[PDB]
Symmetry: D2
Subunit: 388 residues, 4 copies
């Protein structure tokens, strides 16, 4: 009963994950830099489907158009030699000191304009490489103090930036969509569009809402103590789940970027159950960092672990849903009634329905148990492979 | 330099705040019940503008149409004798055991129908009493376990419920709007529409979005570690801040419901600054609980404290914004540039602008300090009244 | 491969767990009261070893010495008829309004004296029933505001109370030990002795430290975002783990009291691994609350779930430790070197050892991978029963 | 009414605070390195009393004994030219890749030995420079996964390390004490001795407990959602507050290191009140980082802000305690009774005292209000300078 991934599983990794050198706020790098070409080859051997990148991961910042073309060619050759795809790309608008107060929402106008040009340049490259989704993580859009940022003006600037990107994409006739990646904090004290909900609401104010979706990350929502599977269901409900970032996080603290499966294991189970049940067909992207305690063999073991854990959880969720005893427990808990309209009969009928109020036996209804604990223990038994 | 409130300040209190008996999950009541009429009179003496209520605060659950009319008449007389208004009303869809799995999203269909009828009945009463806003806090809409609730179906049921309420209001020609009150958790393990952002996004999927807004609470957003003033700015930006609940909370833990001003004091300062700067003209409603350590004299002192703290903060925020030294610091930090469009010149102009990329001096821009610390210390000095 | 508990497993339950009526801060009870005798019989059928109680769970507050003797006799008969033991007892110094500001640390002296007499009376009863451990949870010792409690004076009062209890126990020649149960908050804004560490440190200042230990609870430490297994290891290291409370908690929020196994599943695995490896022989006590969504059948299913989950985890931890591949991975990660003294050779030898500094190759040491990710994936595979 | 600091105020700064270049996990440095000599001179001009250092801040890692003597001489001359003192020093056992799994608790024995030699070398230097306290922050002592560290063995290694350091200090006849600095997490997933309480408890197991105390940091305890003033009171109660680190933190998230006064303002007020009331005479040390948005002028403004905020709070706390109306409110809330022994009359007298149980009127006692809200509003008015 093994769990070997194949490119058909659509597992992708960012170059910066497996390529993280181990530098954290309190320590120096513990691993040497990885050549993107090497990463592509190693990931392909592990069974990955593709890779993603920030412009600066692929092309060192400040590169000449000559070196730039050279880095792209090398990368292209690696993709051709392995069959790896690049379904998503993004811009690095957070590392360089110039973005210390943000990219799209920097107080300095000239920085905002530079941010847009840097993004547009990489959008062209993304399309050339076949990316279908372009992610935007405003890691520097935010503040550490209240008067440093008028949030209403910042949201005006954020909308202006995304509206312009939408105009560019449309004018070039590109077949690419945007996904906003929310995060509540870190590296800024508080970051704008802190959760999936804030990002969804913001999108509805853009000129062309259909071009934008969300790219939620497990750890990000968990940094706000939120239920990740619940947030993903809302994004799916709105038809906005364009991409997803998978990793592990142990509660409310710094962003750990643990391999997927680590952190909140039951939440990972419920997330996989939802993604598979809902038919999500986008990439299963891992944005994680192999701990700095590891050498390169630990890096690859960590990456393989991500995929393995997703596949084990997929098997367990499928068995849970396919179990007749579980199907009967779902009915006992009335999940079937939850899916039925409350009043398909209409408003007037509801108002005239005496069984809905005047003659409703509130005490009999209140005495009915939901049987949620037995259902949950069945879910637990399935997760642990203890069904008998 | 005192701070006496007057009804013109629009401070309102829920009957259940000052009327909280002190029963918590680990202890019995420490105070006797308050007659709503008494609360109305005491609050009027303190300078309040009005009160709010859940149907069950005013009319004991299970009351006959006869007793019901009697309770309303008494309340009306109290309002007439004091000049107090009732700008907001809401339904109690959380106390009675029948709502143990929710009201609008209960798995049991018959409960959902009952929830709608109970709400509609109180909407009629709210209009009669002159309420302009009707709040909905789905405290029981949620779960403690993953399989107990299919969130996509629950959101379908939530939309159905709000859509029906919107149809009812329109058909009756009522001049009343709805405000959804989000909360991340408690009493449920996780509650649906957990933050202001989730509520805003949800509203955009309703049939008549213009009839719905949000009713955010200080403590609620802080339970998710979020920046309350930031969330309020987004709601204002979207034009959805129909009402607001003020209180105090010390971090991520159970909902404390401390008096306004307590908890995160600087966040309270920044919230007041924003509300006043943006011209919010709705009620300043306090949803708090005087601690159970207090007797009735402590209850009124706690209520008076809420208003006093808001007025002190209002004075300090106004002085901060009116201070020429602060106005110069805002310019030094480029808040003025944040308010200017990034590219009013248009996309094509931006693409052709060499100063935006090809000739942009990234190192000179990066070296500019934001001067945010001096600005923040000026804000601190103003808050503490230490300006000299 | 089933998991049936037997009294030999030492699983115990508090009368108040399975007996919780479902009253929370926002709702009324959803279940009728359970007769303690009924609980004893039902728990015995499920395979429990014993029960625990607060004085007020067994004897209604304010009972006459006559009724008191009657309640005890009935309970005794239930214990005799089932073979159930009562290894731990505690006092309720939190429900009654008189303890609104605490028991042992109430500002009112007369309340503190009453608290001690109420405790002493139940200590006598506990010994009579054969309890070996007496737990103290100061749920009301704390504050919501800074000036309400001088913490240094409160700690003086806390020590005075425990010192007197120690004097009483010694003078009566009782064979019973005390266990302090820490909690960071709820129902008070902040509670004194908030974590296992604070409780351990406090104990070292008591007159007879050997009579006191800690009674940590999974959910409590997790409310402060702490690693429960780590805290338990420190308590074991100090030889102070006299008792332990098991349950489930999903992060930093109100105390959920979910059944054991729910909440942080991996932390539960690591806790069981530690308890079994260290040879903890005290009771495996469950302090949890079956959710108020449940009827009585759900209550018993929830209680059975606690025991089942502990037994599944025990099996998985044992297999993990017994796996030769894991034993080799532990060596690869140098857990064996962690157990060896750093300098059994002594200070002077260390100072004279050139290989420890002057000739130590810091770069070669730094390049060694810890191989922690492979080890953790082996732990994950074992937990999920995916070893192959 | 200004607030100018003077060296008599005992404000100290770590070289690494004002010297932080701005490199965070997601970005490069935004400021050039500061020469320690320059920092000493700038801080002296601002009114600081002294500075502190990690060995590696003063002497670049890997320096020859020649360069080492050169760096120390330059530093000494700066101290002599300014009158600045160096009351505390510490070791950097976290930056270099060799400490990726810890220093004192690394699984590799050779690393642990190296850690001790590096520490001992800097202890000699600290004494030479006149430091009275030697701090130890085990930032790398911990783990990201459960099987990576046996906590009981790690605590054995931790005790061994501190015991050896204590033996060294005693054998050299040095007049210096150690202070353990706890932190719950970051950079490790979970760090050993996570809070003040854990550190206090650990100290009681050392061979010479009198040589060790704690060095708590505002932000650290707040990362676990704990009440900092409460933790400081316990450390004072135990006589273990040897040093203290001041800064600002906004809730549970990454360690922000905001200037003191920022973050939780009311907690800062209560901390200052306690330190001054208790007569703490050690340094008021600031371990903070001026945000990376700032240039050098912002760095000095941020440092000056720390001192200014402490002095404003000191003034407000003193006025609060000196206010007769507050003194009467303290009596109304019975803070005076909290300071009186519960039973100086002894155990037997308490048992025979019928007014303590048999004849105690529990209902009359329960009805007494604590008057805590009025007291807290008086504290608020004083903090805000709104007393009239």
């Amino acid at each position: 009963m093994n769990y070997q991934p194949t490119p058909e599983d659509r597992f992708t990794f960012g170059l910066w994950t497996v390529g993280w050198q181990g530098r954290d706020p309190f320590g120096d790098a513990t691993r040497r830099a990885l050549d993107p070409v090497e990463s592509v080859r190693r990931l392909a051997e592990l069974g990955a489907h593709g890779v993603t990148f920030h412009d600066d991961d692929l092309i060192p910042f400040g590169s000449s158009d000559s070196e730039r073309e050279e880095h792209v060619k090398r990368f292209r050759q690696a993709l051709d030699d392995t069959g790896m795809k690049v379904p998503m790309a993004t811009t690095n608008l957070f590392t360089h000191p110039v973005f210390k107060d943000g990219g799209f929402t920097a107080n300095d106008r000239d920085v905002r304009r530079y941010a847009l040009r840097k993004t547009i340049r990489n959008i062209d490259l993304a399309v050339e490489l076949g990316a279908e989704t372009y992610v935007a993580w405003g890691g520097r859009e935010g503040a550490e103090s209240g008067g440093a940022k008028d949030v209403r003006d910042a949201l005006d600037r954020m909308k202006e930036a995304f509206d312009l990107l939408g105009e560019y994409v449309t004018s070039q006739g590109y077949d690419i969509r945007f996904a906003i990646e929310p995060k509540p904090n870190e590296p800024r004290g508080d970051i704008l569009l802190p959760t999936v909900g804030h990002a969804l609401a913001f999108i509805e104010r853009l000129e062309r809402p259909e071009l934008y979706g969300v790219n939620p990350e497990v750890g990000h929502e968990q940094m706000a103590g939120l239920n990740f599977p619940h947030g993903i269901a809302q994004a799916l409900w709105a038809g906005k789940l364009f991409h997803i970032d998978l990793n592990g996080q142990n509660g409310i603290k710094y962003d750990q970027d643990l391999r997927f499966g680590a952190g909140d294991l039951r939440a990972a189970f419920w997330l996989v159950d939802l993604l598979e049940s809902a038919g999500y067909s986008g990439p299963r992207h891992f944005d994680f960092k192999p701990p700095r305690t590891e050498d390169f063999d630990g890096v690859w073991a960590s990456a393989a672990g991500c995929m393995r854990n997703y596949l084990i959880l997929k098997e367990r969720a499928a068995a849970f849903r396919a179990d007749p005893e579980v199907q009967e427990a779902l009915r006992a808990s009335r999940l079937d009634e939850l899916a039925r309209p409350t009043a398909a009969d209409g408003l007037q009928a509801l108002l005239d329905d005496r069984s809905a109020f005047e003659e409703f036996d509130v005490d009999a209804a209140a005495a009915r148990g939901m049987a949620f604990e037995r259902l949950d223990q069945l879910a637990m038994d399935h997760l642990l492979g203890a069904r008998g």
